């Protein structure tokens, strides 16, 4: 059970590290969809509180 | 059974340990103390029936 738990935890940690690296690389590849979504989110939030 | 790595190994060991197995035991064939009990009563306890009773 200790070996099965250690393997599952190692696999989850390795997968999380690979996902983190992919997310960081995508943001550095000038994302046009990220820039347009950041301006629209700010306007919607300020109109719901006023 | 669900934590072990190899398939059908805990299940097989469980079944054989819950059946029967040898143990360090004996039988009442070697009755050394039972045979001596009759002889000891017949020489020590029966001697009082004729020595102590006469006195």
């Amino acid at each position: 059970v200790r070996y099965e738990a250690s393997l599952r935890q190692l696999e989850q940690r390795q997968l999380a590290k690979s996902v983190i690296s992919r997310v960081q690389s995508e943001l550095g590849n000038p994302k046009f969809q990220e820039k347009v979504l950041q301006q629209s989110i700010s306007e919607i939030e300020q109109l719901l509180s006023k | 059974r669900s934590v072990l790595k190899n398939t059908s190994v805990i299940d097989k060991i469980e079944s054989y340990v819950k059946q029967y197995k040898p143990v360090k035991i004996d039988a009442s064939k070697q009755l050394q103390v039972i045979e001596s009990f009759e002889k000891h009563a017949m020489t020590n306890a029966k001697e009082t029936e004729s020595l102590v009773s006469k006195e």
């Binding site: 599952r8 696999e11 989850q12 997968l15 996902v19 700010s42 939030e45 | -």
Partner: protein, 500 residues
């Protein structure tokens, strides 16, 4: 089960969707001065942009003074600081049982998320004059010397004080171990859950300890709360309060907890550290002015609730470390007068073979017999006073001038009584094991037996009583009170055996 990594990624997907304060002025030595945080509460929690949490303690006019829960390498001038909107608080409920948590109640064992029935604050008003009762239940430690001489009660606060390396922790531990007797049962109202607070201890030493708790299947009913040596001064200072709440849950809910504060001398060392660095001007031995208030408010939180309030108790065994036997130093003095009595352990006693090295002369329980078991009470009639008279005659013995039949008499008994209270670590005794021992000593059946042999008397006696007169042992236990005939059977039973 079937790609377990995919279930954790789908549940932590959408979370950050509604998160749109002060700046740091200077930071050093666990402290951060901070311009802003205008709506902040005294004693409120704040997150720094870097991650590390902190607590606001000095809301001054220009700025706020914050003690950190972390290291500070990670905090820089100008870094944005954030309001939580909460005062420091903990998870509570029986979910904590078995767990090793830090001051804020985070698992540090490795066993995953705490399940709590709710959350208390770290500082909570002690129950008033109004909702309480007399302490009348024993908290049986299974320590001969303690359970006959300084009997502790469900609800009472009882100081364990002595020098370093005297056996302070050992007394506390042996108490916890004992509760097995009742915790593996099903009668919830005879149970005693333990909370052990590690303050300023090194980690391995908390380890070495939870191991022993487990070696004794004692961990299932304990909660260790750890503020080890390396943690932030604020966590150390806080632990006892957070802990008090964890076990306040039990008291409030009809059950009985036991809180061991090991040890307050360090909590005060740390509380001194917040203050000197927050620059609050110092008291005696550089402590803050209200270092007394510090402990008083914690220790008052232990109490035995009234029937209307559920009859729950919380019982406190604080520990305090002295130097050079001096009890007249600041902190010990403070706590000594706060608690319902003390157990003094002494190094001299130790090395000449009295272990527990309890000092009968100085140890008291102010509740007294109210919390002793009736049976133990009955055969312990006068023992503690007698043991005093014994030291008396033993001091006069130093004159080495001839003794009479009265002094030699009480010397023989006191020596044997002394010896009869010695006890090995990790071996708490049932009441019915204790009772006949005490009875044999008191009524002087031990008085014609070699001193080195009283060791063997004890176990050889108990062995025989279990074997033969088990019917007594089980009555003592079930009834807790030696009826007149039971004194008879016991009287007979002892004489019998002393003639080998």
């Amino acid at each position: 089960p079937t790609e377990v990594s995919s279930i954790l990624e789908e549940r932590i997907k959408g979370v950050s969707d509604e998160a749109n304060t002060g700046r740091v002025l200077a930071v050093g030595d666990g402290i951060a001065r901070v311009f802003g945080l205008n709506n902040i509460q005294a004693e409120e929690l704040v997150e720094f942009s870097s991650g590390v949490k902190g607590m606001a303690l000095n809301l001054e006019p220009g700025q706020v003074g914050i003690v950190l829960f972390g290291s500070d390498r990670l905090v820089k001038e100008g870094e944005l600081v954030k309001r939580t909107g909460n005062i420091v608080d903990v998870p509570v409920g029986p979910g904590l049982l078995g767990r090793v948590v830090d001051a804020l109640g985070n698992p540090i064992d490795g066993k995953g998320p705490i399940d709590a029935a709710g959350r208390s604050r770290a500082q909570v008003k002690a129950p008033g004059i109004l909702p309480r009762r007399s302490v009348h239940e024993p908290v049986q430690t299974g320590l001969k010397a303690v359970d006959a001489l300084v009997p502790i009660g469900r609800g009472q606060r009882e100081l364990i004080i002595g020098d370093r390396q005297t056996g302070k922790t050992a007394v506390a531990l042996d108490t916890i171990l004992n509760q097995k007797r009742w915790n593996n049962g099903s009668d919830e109202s005879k149970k005693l859950y333990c909370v052990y607070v590690a303050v300023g201890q090194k980690r391995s030493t908390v380890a070495q300890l939870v191991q022993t708790l487990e070696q004794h299947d004692a961990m299932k009913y304990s909660i260790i709360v750890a503020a080890t040596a390396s943690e932030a001064a604020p966590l150390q200072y806080l632990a006892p309060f957070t802990a008090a709440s964890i076990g306040e849950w039990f008291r409030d809910n009809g059950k009985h907890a036991l809180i061991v504060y090991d040890d307050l001398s360090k909590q005060a060392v740390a509380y001194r550290q917040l203050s000197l660095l927050l620059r609050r001007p110092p008291g005696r031995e550089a402590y803050p002015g209200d270092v007394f208030y510090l402990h008083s408010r914690l220790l008052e939180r232990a109490a035995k609730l009234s029937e209307k309030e559920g009859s729950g108790s919380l019982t406190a065994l604080p520990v305090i470390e002295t130097q050079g036997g001096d009890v007249s130093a600041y902190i010990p003095t403070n706590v000594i007068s706060i608690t319902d009595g003390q157990i003094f352990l002494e190094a001299e006693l130790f090395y000449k073979g009295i272990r527990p090295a309890i000092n009968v002369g100085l140890s008291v329980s102010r509740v007294g017999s109210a919390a002793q078991v009736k049976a133990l009470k009955q055969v312990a009639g006068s023992l503690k006073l007698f043991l005093a008279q014994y030291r008396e005659v033993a001091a006069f013995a130093q004159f080495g001038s001839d003794l009479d039949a009265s002094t030699k008499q009480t010397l023989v008994r006191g020596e044997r009584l002394t010896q009869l209270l010695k006890q090995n670590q990790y071996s708490p005794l049932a009441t019915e094991e204790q009772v006949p021992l005490i009875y044999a000593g008191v009524n002087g059946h031990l008085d014609g037996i070699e001193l080195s042999r009283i060791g063997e008397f004890e176990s050889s006696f108990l062995s025989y009583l279990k074997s033969n007169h088990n019917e007594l042992l089980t009555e003592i236990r079930e009834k807790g009170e030696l009826s007149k005939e039971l004194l008879a059977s016991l009287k007979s039973a002892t004489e019998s055996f002393v003639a080998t």
